[PDB]
């Protein structure tokens, strides 16, 4: 059993956006399909549900009128059409099902998709070295939008001792983070340390060598 979502991303305030929830290993005709969302740093909020056999729907008050949940049994897929989007709608959106006609609650969930409602343009990060002089070194991943970015070290060959910090929103409205690692002092100047920064929303790829 799988629930695989798609369709999120960055959308303008007042805009529209449509999420899909594709089911495999079971027939959505047999169950209820739910959408549940989680704003950054908050808890879980139920959004809507549908019984695909007859198309019956229920909605949370905060999305009543603006959102439409729907389903296509011949595609084994459910949808969330989001309209009049607000900053309050920024969240990770999950799809789920009532397993066992509810008795099993939400036993399977999609992987989630991030929806960001903002008028700000995309912007890739600048990557600056945190130079060393046991040593610590790292990369400052500054001024990007929107989330997320991923960081690796030496293309995944350096994993132990790495701390990639959660992004913080700066007063400018752009995100920033650092990723650091502790290495042997004796390794500096001969061992080579590169952070691999990836920002898919802006199609930005940066490999930054950090030297002492």
């Amino acid at each position: 059993v799988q629930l695989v979502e798609s369709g999120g991303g960055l959308v303008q305030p007042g805009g529209s956006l449509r999420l899909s929830c594709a089911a495999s290993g079971f027939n959505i005709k047999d169950t209820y399909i739910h959408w549940v969302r989680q704003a950054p740093g908050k808890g879980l909020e139920w959004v809507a549900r549908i019984y695909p056999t007859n198309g019956y729907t229920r909605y949370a008050d905060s999305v009543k009128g603006r959102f439409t949940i729907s389903a296509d049994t011949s595609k084994n897929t459910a949808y969330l059409q989001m309209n009049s989007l607000r900053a309050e709608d920024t969240a990770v959106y999950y799809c789920s099902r009532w397993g066992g006609d509810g008795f099993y609650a939400m036993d399977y969930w999609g992987q989630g998709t991030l929806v960001t409602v903002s008028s700000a343009s995309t912007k890739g990060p600048s990557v600056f070295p945190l130079a060393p002089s046991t040593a610590a070194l790292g990369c400052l991943v500054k001024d990007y939008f929107p989330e997320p970015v991923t960081v690796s070290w030496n293309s995944g060959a350096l994993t132990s001792g790495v701390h990639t910090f959660p992004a913080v929103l700066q007063s400018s409205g752009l995100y920033s983070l650092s990723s650091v690692v502790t290495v042997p002092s004796s390794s500096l100047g001969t061992q080579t340390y590169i952070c691999n920064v990836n920002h898919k929303p802006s199609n930005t790829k940066v490999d930054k060598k950090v030297e002492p």
Binding site: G43, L44, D107, S126, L140, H163, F165, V168, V180
Partner: protein, 212 residues
């Protein structure tokens, strides 16, 4: 129907017995589920219909009911149970969630390793200067990081970020980033971060002289 979950967070050691409770604002029969959510992942079903262990969930998890009060029990807390736990009722539509319980692993006190990083020459070129202070692998989570510029305490030019608890050693890491203009950075000489933590007998200061 509301679900009041307590406590909001708790700290317990590996092998401890953990109790999380949830009170329904009215009768919900046994239509109650418990979920686990780990950082970056979708929620995961643990208990359905108040007391039934979901397939694949370790037997240290159990649930029970007493009227409107529902209880999740972990008999022997493990390092991998670092998560937020959520109770949920589906007796009526809409289904509602409790506000969550952050569970962290208790461990012995560990002092942070402290490092300070000056702004890179590349970033100074663009006209901004970021100074980063790193606190590595400490416990507990609480720490006080103060910035001093020419021995003068700073206010409102720095932001903090903390990693999730480490899977192996159960420690935290923390970054503090002081952001200045290039012009303001070039007007001062000594940049220091001062760290107060339970694991330190007295505050630790790391500093550098600009340009040296």
């Amino acid at each position: 129907i509301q679900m009041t979950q307590s406590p909001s967070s708790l700290s317990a050691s590996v092998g401890d017995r953990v109790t999380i409770t949830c009170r329904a604002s009215q009768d919900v029969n046994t239509a109650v589920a418990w979920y686990q959510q780990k950082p970056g992942k979708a929620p995961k079903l643990l208990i359905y219909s108040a007391s039934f262990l979901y397939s694949g969930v370790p037997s240290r998890f159990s649930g029970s009911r007493s009227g409107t009060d529902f209880t999740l029990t972990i008999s022997s807390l493990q390092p991998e149970d670092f998560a937020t736990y959520y109770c949920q009722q589906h007796y009526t539509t809409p289904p509602t969630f409790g506000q969550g319980t952050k569970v962290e692993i208790k461990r012995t006190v560990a002092a942070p390793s402290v490092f300070i990083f000056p702004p890179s020459d590349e970033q100074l070129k663009s006209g901004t200067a970021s100074v980063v202070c790193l606190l590595n692998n400490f416990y507990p989570r609480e720490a006080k990081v103060q910035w001093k510029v020419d021995n003068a305490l700073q206010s409102g030019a720095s932001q903090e970020s903390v990693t999730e608890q480490d899977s192996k050693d159960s420690t935290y890491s923390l970054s503090s980033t002081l952001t200045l203009s290039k012009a303001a950075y070039e007007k001062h000489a000594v940049y220091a971060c001062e760290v107060t933590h339970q694991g330190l007998s007295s505050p630790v200061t790391k500093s550098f002289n600009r340009g040296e």
